[PDB]
Design a protein around this ligand. Structure first.
Ligand SMILES: O=C(O)C1=C[C@@H](OP(=O)(O)O)[C@@H](O)[C@H](O)C1
Length: 445
């Protein structure tokens, strides 16, 4: 069921720790490794529940996946070699696995059914199902294009040129993956850049995929379908979204000095760091280097005094999953922090804009929730913040709401309680141990 947890005011956080692997790249490592010809070897894989579910779905379609020592080894089926699954593919809490797999297997001439948990089942799939319908896929979904969904691909899919209407890397990714089993050229036009793990990894696996960027920033991504993919050696970098939690905690808890190692620094993932630096954060980027084909660095974070800033709508895609923890940082900053262009937060694991605003208010923070924006006014000394009565923040099955508010409790005058910590393991099973090791006081009921 649910397992509440309470975070208490802590003394300085201190230590050096390696952050778990990147979730986005980990999902794709299992997917591309399972699809490619031959063997793929992965080190640094995130072993959270979301990623394990993607792995099980790939096994259900013929990939052999196993862990030898600290390396995941995958024997792929080759492009065009996916086998019809016997039962529904259960993605649990993971929209990434679900949406990308819809594109990947929806274009195959067999039935595939997709199911998930109470959170995933409420999220919109129309954004990926519409382009698939244009490609010839037959779709059976629940009202509003929600799970459960059953797809059946045509004998020969139709390649399309699709302009993504919202800044979603998952929609871009689903169309490109569908293009892998479609004859001809599939083109995705992305007006605003989103995380590019699919493009970079498919090129690494040998796909004839090109990316052209116009001077105005619009990206035209072309993929030639039904081409060979070759197994690769993958070294997964640390998750910058998971890094955000100990990083913001170190900035807010006085007397802190925390170094996080091997953090992915791809600019489509670092909007929070840029934003915190503008607010006055002391974050040092150490030994920037190339590892596994990606930019990584170690980050040394020290306690800082923060000031509110205006966060523009165009930075949102580069930090979309970090708005919950940014809002918590803003609760302790001098002045107002204003964030717009947040419509996408309403369709995540939880409606994050509503969950964050309600959680902040429950914990004494002055904030204003707009249809697509949030304004937060802070109290630097944390006085009056938190909830002395022990009232619990509603997490709405969202791991990031649970983690963000637990970070808040390490700083607020009064403890912060979340109604459930059980979903944290979907993306960061190491969270409790990692934070405790740094000195955080978090009591699990
Ligand atoms: O492709 C990916 O790995 C992801 C893209 C984002 O979703 P959207 O495409 O809906 O923005 C992000 O919020 C999600 O956690 C993972």
């Amino acid at each position: 069921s649910s397992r509440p947890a309470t975070a208490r005011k802590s003394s300085g956080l201190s230590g050096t720790v390696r952050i778990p692997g990147d979730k986005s790249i980990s999902h794709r490592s299992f997917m591309f490794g399972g699809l490619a010809s031959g063997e793929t070897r992965i080190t640094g894989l995130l072993e959270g529940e979301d990623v394990i579910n993607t792995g099980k779905a790939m096994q259900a379609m013929g990939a052999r996946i196993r862990k030898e020592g600290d390396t995941w080894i995958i024997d792929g089926v080759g492009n065009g070699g996916l086998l019809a699954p016997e039962a529904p593919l259960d993605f649990g809490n993971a929209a990434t696995g679900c949406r990308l797999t819809m594109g990947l297997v929806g274009v195959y001439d067999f039935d595939s059914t997709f199911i998930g948990d109470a959170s995933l089942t409420k999220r919109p799939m129309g954004r990926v199902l519409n382009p698939l319908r244009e490609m010839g896929v037959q779709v059976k979904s629940e009202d509003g294009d929600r799970l459960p969904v059953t797809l059946r691909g045509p004998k020969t899919p139709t390649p399309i040129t699709y302009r993504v209407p919202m800044a979603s890397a998952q929609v871009k990714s689903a169309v490109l993956l569908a293009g892998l089993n479609t004859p001809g050229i599939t083109t995705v036009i992305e007006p605003i850049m989103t995380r590019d793990h699919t493009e970079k990894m498919l090129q690494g696996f040998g796909a004839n995929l090109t990316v052209e960027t116009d001077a105005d920033g619009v990206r035209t991504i072309r993929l030639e379908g039904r081409g060979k993919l070759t197994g690769q050696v993958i070294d997964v970098p640390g998750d910058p979204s998971s890094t955000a939690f100990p990083l913001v905690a170190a900035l807010l808890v006085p007397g802190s000095d925390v170094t996080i190692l091997n953090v992915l620094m791809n600019p489509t993932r670092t909007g929070l760091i840029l934003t915190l630096q503008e607010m006055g954060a002391d974050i040092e980027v150490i030994n920037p280097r190339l590892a596994g084909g990606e930019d990584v660095a170690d980050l040394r974070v020290r306690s800082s005094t923060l000031k509110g800033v205006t966060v523009p709508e165009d930075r949102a895609p580069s930090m979309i999953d970090e708005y919950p923890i940014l809002a918590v940082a803003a609760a302790f900053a001098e002045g107002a922090t204003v964030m717009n262009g947040l419509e996408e937060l309403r369709v995540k694991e939880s409606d994050r804009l509503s969950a964050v605003a309600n959680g902040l208010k429950l914990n004494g923070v002055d904030c204003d929730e707009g249809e697509t924006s949030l304004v937060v006014r802070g109290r630097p000394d944390g006085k009056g913040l938190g909830n002395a009565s022990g009232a619990a923040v509603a997490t709405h099955l969202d791991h990031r709401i649970a983690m963000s508010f637990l970070v808040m409790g390490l700083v607020s005058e009064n403890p912060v309680t979340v109604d459930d910590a059980t979903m944290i393991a979907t993306s960061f099973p190491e969270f409790m141990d990692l934070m405790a090791g740094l000195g955080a006081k978090i009591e699990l009921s």
